Design a protein around this nucleic acid. Structure first.
Lengths: 296, 297, 297, 296
DNA sequence: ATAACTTCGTATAGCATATGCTATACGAAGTTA
DNA sequence: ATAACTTCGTATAGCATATGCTATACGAAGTTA
DNA sequence: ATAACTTCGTATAGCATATGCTATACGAAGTTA
DNA sequence: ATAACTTCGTATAGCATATGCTATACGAAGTTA
């Protein structure tokens, strides 16, 4: 019982590299949240008792949290126990049922899983047309980024990993980016994305002015300082938080400052180009497999 | 574990013909590597224990072995074991978790599946251009081989397996894969140049001694390796000595042909079955890059 | 089995809001039928035993119940049981084998899934043609309803749920499903004829007393049944008294509209999303019969 | 052990109607074959001992039987034990391995799973053109059959079940046949197959002359006697063996008598129209889903 | 008596589906004319 | 010696083959207006 | 001092996949103006 | 009485919702040419 369990955790934590860094992040997050509520309520946090998991979740639901997040909290616990030999809280009618009731309660009230505010072709062009005539080094990059973004529909972390070495041009001129790792695909073959003749121009302008080509293993996107001086590196990639930042700025520039409220998706974000390109594609009546080919 | 495994192993040797020789060779090979490593690392190699294996695997990772290669090593282990009352290491948390991490870890390093240098048509014409007028027997044979290889997108083995009578001048007077015409023309020259036509049931291709003389047969199977050699040599003949380094596929390999065909094939005006139907399947470098580029411009 | 089930049942009643009322109603209903049958047949209805169940099922088969109906009966049983330490009868050889045979047996008898009489456009124009000039309040309401039902391929419920302000004269001056024009025209007449426009947040449709007077609300939900009635009556109004017999769908049902639309829709010049996008999905009777006919001629 | 096992067989045999009549047929066939070899070799036939299953199969392989048939014999046994609580012979390295060795041995020698001799459009038309001008009652049917055959690609047993009641015409005229049961699909909704304007003519000619319409539940295809008098029935359908017979005759008529050898598929059979129509469809570059729509 | 079946049994294909075996690459040693 | 190549071994890429039925294929024997 | 990040934590969407809940139909009794 | 309809119950057809991660979203706090 407690010898195998304790062992099963050592092996897992031992090979956490076999899990997404984020997975672990949320794990430790949920537990920290959970183990808190337990403390506050004087309850043994692990192994969680179903009844106790129920109140917890019901308590999350009352704090205003969104269904998906609750399913996460429930999800993390579920994995903490299963991957420990122990049985999961979802394996209890109390948890399994509270969860549905909850999900049904929120949805019935109108809760909905939002989607990033789209960045469609019009936005791109509108954006390009504007900053294209700018010599500002920070401007040449963002435009490059937003170009690859839209063009490739690549998630931002996938973009931030593009090695200068990964860049390759076709015989027709167009650039090509090779991608091995990606949220949904961990491959040594991966896929390559072709850039439109124009976006490649955009990308080329950035490289020159950035100096990212002084080294093949240099990250394609690097950071840029106030003095407009770039900073190629093959060890530190520009933070995805920053990329999401390119999207907020470009938006703020065209549409002004965010609402005062505080809601979400009131501006472009790391996924805008993906969802936007996607739409634009279907509205163009592109082949389904072609669409899937694009987003994967 | 004892007699049950004994008996299981005995069944395995009994119906050894249930697996290919290539499979058996890999099995023995992996056991050979797994065994040695175990001695070195003072561990029982049979039955193999999770932690022990796991360790073995992390060793190969460091060894620099591809993921594909590592998966084969566990695969063979799981085979030997499934084929005995004993379980399978792949059925353990540990062994299962290292594979997960090893797989991921290695895909963030810079591991990329190999390809096979495309032997394109341009390449072909160039070759043709030199061995063209050359009268050296083997030289000739080499041009014909590369001809069918490229004109048939047939894997080498098949290419080697081909015999005389199998070549039926069907339609147009050309030799069921059909040889273009300029290629039918090639195969012919050597055909006679080697005197294979004689005893049919021979093979399109054969051995070509250092004295420039053939040696048709119907008992000897031309090593695939040799075929791969033809490509290689042909490459070093046009691009000089190998590139060295460590990389793999810096010259042409047996399939460079198939790849080459599909390539220039799709490059021009062709559907997708052509790229499949020919070889026998189940290119981004070109310009057919996709929708988003189309849409954009 | 004892307190564990007790507690399990207690959880079920605790978070009863995890299942729909419709689901609960079916559960209770099946238990009610299963229970009675058991008393009659002197068997413990809980926990339910395979052979016992099996017997129960073969009873329903004979009862003449559709397969779909029988699957629901086991489904409810498996639910009640899964939701208790006790297993599930569906997880038994017997219960599993009878379903297999019952399913097959019944498909060789002559069991055919029902449809829902298509309420086609021709049908619609005909209706329009009579209630057209009629000035009877309900008569009117009935024409408008059938209008949105057909002009929106919206399931009834939604149709019932609709309120006043929800109708936004968006584009062209027509009332986010958009009402054609001749239909926007319809909804309007009654809208006033009933005085619903007044307190918004009311409902497009409402009750129409036997004295021919409306009764707008924002507290009362117009029974779907009523809506289904509108169709029915409308049919008996044009095709006289029902056909009787035993068959199901000898008149129009709530969805007859959706069906009708898709039909005449695909019948003319329309893609397939139109047949899907409108209603909200995931016709051979027409002429789009297929390839082999195309090929043949 | 022997009480549950014996019980498990009673329940199964009790609900055999939940299994294809043929499944059972082959079952009893295989066992009869097997239990024989056992007797002949003085071995307990059930529960089969792996070693004994190996020789049996090896013995089948030597008698010239085709891989697929062996996998059947092995398959039936496998089900007899599994559905009896007992473990299957394939669950033994000796059986599992002999099976592969065998399959590899036969295939390596060139064994191949044949396909029915095709009955393509040309054959149909060639066939139609000929018997179309015939008043012979047996001729009017066969042509009807071969028409539905090709048109619908329906397996023969599926054809032999077409109720006169199942027949329905479109508003454009074309006939339509409704099918609920079918090898791969047991549905109360099933599918309907539209007939080409011409094949429906063919079908109509048959009905009149057959009198199959005197009753809705009368089988569309009935038998015809020497005096050319049909025999509608709603209880006895024409044997599939007979339908396969239509295919041999029509062939013999156009191409003469079978080879003297004795091989298989030297003439048309119950599946010729299916495989043939199929080909004709693809060679016409018809959409894949359309093709699948056709054969299902 | 005979066309046209039907029943019957042994042989073998057809259709969904869960799931590791087999082939090619390439340096390199061994083998022959 | 060494060309031209075979046999080996380890690395790594490419493509199937057990499940469990369900149904057709074909001859030979029995059935009936 | 400040632009432009980065690190960090809590909140919530995105992607494969295994798998029973929910809605509509329709005779029919109960309820109201 | 009875129109016009609601509430019920049983039959039967239509459409999702737990798995288990992996990744983005956004503010607030810390870092550095």
């Amino acid at each position: 019982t407690s010898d195998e369990v304790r062992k099963n955790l050592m092996d897992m934590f031992r090979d956490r590299q076999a899990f997404s860094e984020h997975t672990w992040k949320m794990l430790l997050s949920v537990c920290r949240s959970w183990a808190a509520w337990c403390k506050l309520n004087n309850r043994k946090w692990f192994p969680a008792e179903p009844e106790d998991v129920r109140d917890y979740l019901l308590y999350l639901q009352a704090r205003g949290l969104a269904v998906k997040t609750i399913q996460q909290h429930l999800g993390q616990l579920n994995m903490l126990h299963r991957r420990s030999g122990l049985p999961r809280p979802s394996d209890s009618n109390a948890v399994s049922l509270v969860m549905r009731r909850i999900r049904k309660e929120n949805v019935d009230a109108g809760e909905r899983a939002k989607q990033a505010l789209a960045f469609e072709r019009t936005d791109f062009d509108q954006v390009r047309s504007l900053m294209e005539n700018s010599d500002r080094c920070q401007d040449i990059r963002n435009l490059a980024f937003l170009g690859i973004a839209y063009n490739t529909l690549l998630r931002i972390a996938e973009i931030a990993r593009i090695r200068v070495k990964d860049i390759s041009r076709t015989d027709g001129g167009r650039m090509l980016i090779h991608i091995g790792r990606t949220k949904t695909l961990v491959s040594t073959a991966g896929v390559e994305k072709a850039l439109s003749l124009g976006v490649t121009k955009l990308v080329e302008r950035w490289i020159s002015v950035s100096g990212v080509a002084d080294d093949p293993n240099n990250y394609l996107f690097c950071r840029v300082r106030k003095n407009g001086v770039a900073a190629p590196s093959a060890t530190s990639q520009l933070s995805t938080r920053a990329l999401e930042g390119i999207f907020e700025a470009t938006h703020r520039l065209i549409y002004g400052a965010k609402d005062d409220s505080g809601q979400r998706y009131l501006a472009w974000s790391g996924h805008s180009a993906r969802v936007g390109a996607a739409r634009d594609m279907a509205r163009a009546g592109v082949s389904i497999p072609e669409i899937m080919q694009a987003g994967g």
